[PDB]
Structure 1
Amino acid sequence: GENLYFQGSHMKAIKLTGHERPLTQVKYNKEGDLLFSCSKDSSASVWYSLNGERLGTLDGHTGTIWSIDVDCFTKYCVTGSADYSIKLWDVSNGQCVATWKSPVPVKRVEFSPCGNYFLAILDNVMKNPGSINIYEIERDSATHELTKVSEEPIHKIITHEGLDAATVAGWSTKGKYIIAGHKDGKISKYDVSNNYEYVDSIDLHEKSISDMQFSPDLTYFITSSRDTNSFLVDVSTLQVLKKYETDCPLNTAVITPLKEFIILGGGQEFEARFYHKIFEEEIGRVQGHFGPLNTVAISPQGTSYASGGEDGFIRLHHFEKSYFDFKYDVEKAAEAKEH
């Protein structure tokens, strides 16, 4: 018999096919009109988020692309690859316009909030202890166009005494700190203005940190781990605000704009789970992947999200009316008792 529901759907999904290989990362740009993706293939893809149509591909790398970011102008994106390189690309035409070499695979890249720097995670391999490298891009004030790059990072944060190698990292608000996640499930924080010096760190997970993603304003963040837990954590003091407990090993987590939710995803060799960010309770499960979810991203306006799987597919979701009207009774009391 046919399944019937009291109200309209929470979202509509479409499936993007492009990658013949497991997804490693999806990312929206700032206006949320573009989606960037990378996978175990040697090329990345750029999509329109409105209808899922592929705008083009970024070709040049010779192995897996582990990570992709896009600057705040949507002028350049940056990729880091198993082929031991980092590449900068012009988004308007797909051209590689700078390459940097690494002695080890590069597992994660991310632009600073103002576009002038990016970080790269260099894996530990053999005697290499791993690092977070920071690269500078000098820009034209008018066109935002690249004017100078150097072959060297301007600073290498070498794995710090008593931490395993970093796996994920990103920038806090206005790029004042870098927060890093580690292979031993710790988190640490580096003060950018004081030469990237260590500040503090904390135990958090039992296994390696698998993702870390910030809030819309970069003042707090969410982690996930294959130990099946996720934590909300405040940048300024690194205190734990919230914990989300699942029965599922977690590859990815995000904080939603606009609604007070969290999205988690993972799986064992398949559904994204939504949680209420404040009450720490599961509010839904969104089916559609054929294996584990490897990455999730949400648009900065909070009106769609994408998930990429081990199946090679990206699912793109546009939120409907029942999503934007989803409210606990206490939240309904809060809103109506305003005006």
Structure 2
Amino acid sequence: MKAIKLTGHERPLTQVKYNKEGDLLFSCSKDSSASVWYSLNGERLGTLDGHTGTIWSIDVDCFTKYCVTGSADYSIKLWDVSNGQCVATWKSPVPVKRVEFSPCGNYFLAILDNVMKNPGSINIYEIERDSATHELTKVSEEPIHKIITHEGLDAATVAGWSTKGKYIIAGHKDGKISKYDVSNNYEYVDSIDLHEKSISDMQFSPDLTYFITSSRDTNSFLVDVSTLQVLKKYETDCPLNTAVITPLKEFIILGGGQEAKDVTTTSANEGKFEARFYHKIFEEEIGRVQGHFGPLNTVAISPQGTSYASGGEDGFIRLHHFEKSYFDFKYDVEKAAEAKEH
């Protein structure tokens, strides 16, 4: 791959996202404005200004019409992507740590942190849209449902929707994953106990039928939506902040790291926080890609599988375009089976 470095944020990155066609990249950080970048060259398209606190989460709808942000300033905002204006704000009694649109763009969930005495919860909001322009017509000030921290779990930290929005999957501060049935008024269906530490990320495969978890306990699990069966385990010696499933190739990208603190780093050893690529099916580390000056906090892959971006505690985003060696990377039994076709 070739990498270039985007600078805009002077503060640690909290989330990067591609849009559905993979030509724009959205990012937020501990600063109070989010940025939008062309994913072709890393040019900055513009910024989203209005929050007064760290923005923890950003998401962009399937039409690339609105993006939504969740903030430490106790608010969620909805933004119109074409002019960067805020079109709706909801106030929250607690910080909002994560936001995600449903696959068709009519709902978004927001994770409300369990602070002060609030037990925390996943709020669901409805955006009624014009069926032609996908512009909004109505937003309600209330969520249409609140999944309060389930009895026996700690608060959710991450959540996303499965295929067609039929389930919400969540990860919690006690290393558990839980599942909620959207048709049945978001009722609790099941949970599994995976990590010894909090779940720090959870991301979906391209069809939304399986997902990948990561934790600072150094492990990552590939998990099936319908059964919650664990399919694969990637075992590392590194505390993980983030993980993704790649399209096109059978790869997994993991990212995290431990801040240096007291030990001296030499100029030879500087810039060596890496993303690790694993083969998805064989569970084997196949590469490490250097370039960051602090832990990786977020990774995102384009839906075309042709680039990936990572945002660091160093305040940079590295944007990576894959090359021919990547596309042709193949185990011998994979060459064999791809040729067996003809």
TM-score, normalised relative to structure 1: 0.97
Q: Determine the C-alpha separation between the residues in 2 that align with 1:302 and 1:290.
A: 25
Residues 198-225 of structure 1: per-residue CA shift (max 9 Å, x gap)? 0000101100000000000000000000
Alignment partner of 1:120 is 2:110: yes
> Offset of 1:49 from its aligned partner?
0.2
SS of alignment partner, residue 334 of structure 2: helix
1:157 aligns to what? 147
Residues 16-57 of structure 1: per-residue CA shift (max 9 Å, x gap)? 000000000000000000000000000000000000000000
- Mind listing any 5+ residue stretches in structure 2 that lack a counterpart? 259-271
Q: Determine the C-alpha separation between the residues in 1 that align with 2:91 and 2:181.
A: 26
1:8 aligns to what? none
SS of alignment partner, residue 333 of structure 2: helix
Q: Determine the C-alpha separation between the residues in 2 that align with 1:52 and 1:337.
A: 40
Q: Structure 1 segments of 4 or more deviating over 3 A?
A: none
SS of alignment partner, residue 292 of structure 2: coil
Q: Determine the C-alpha separation between the residues in 2 that align with 1:23 and 1:190.
A: 30
Q: Determine the C-alpha separation between the residues in 2 that align with 1:126 and 1:93.
A: 36
Q: Determine the C-alpha separation between the residues in 2 that align with 1:257 and 1:46.
A: 23
> Offset of 1:127 from its aligned partner?
1.4
TM-score, normalised relative to structure 2: 0.96
SS of alignment partner, residue 168 of structure 1: strand
SS of alignment partner, residue 32 of structure 1: coil
> Offset of 1:97 from its aligned partner?
0.3
Residues 98-136 of structure 1: per-residue CA shift (max 9 Å, x gap)? 000100000000000000000000000121000000000
Residues 263-321 of structure 1: per-residue CA shift (max 9 Å, x gap)? 00000090000000000000000000000000000000000000000000000000000
Equivalent of 1:34, from 24, 40, 56?
Answer: 24
RMSD: 0.7
Residues 53-111 of structure 1: per-residue CA shift (max 9 Å, x gap)? 00000000000000000000000000000000000000001000000010000000000
Q: Determine the C-alpha separation between the residues in 1 that align with 2:151 and 2:174.
A: 13
1:325 aligns to what? 328
Q: Determine the C-alpha separation between the residues in 1 that align with 2:86 and 2:298.
A: 25
SS of alignment partner, residue 50 of structure 1: coil
2:41 aligns to what? 51
Alignment partner of 1:310 is 2:281: no
Equivalent of 2:167, from 162, 177, 182?
Answer: 177
- Mind listing any 5+ residue stretches in structure 1 that lack a counterpart? 1-10
> Offset of 1:257 from its aligned partner?
0.1
Q: Determine the C-alpha separation between the residues in 2 that align with 1:114 and 1:186.
A: 27
Equivalent of 1:72, from 59, 62, 73?
Answer: 62
Q: Determine the C-alpha separation between the residues in 1 that align with 2:75 and 2:135.
A: 22
Q: Determine the C-alpha separation between the residues in 2 that align with 1:286 and 1:149.
A: 43
Residues 236-287 of structure 1: per-residue CA shift (max 9 Å, x gap)? 0000000000000000000000000000000009000000000000000000
Q: Determine the C-alpha separation between the residues in 1 that align with 2:156 and 2:216.
A: 16
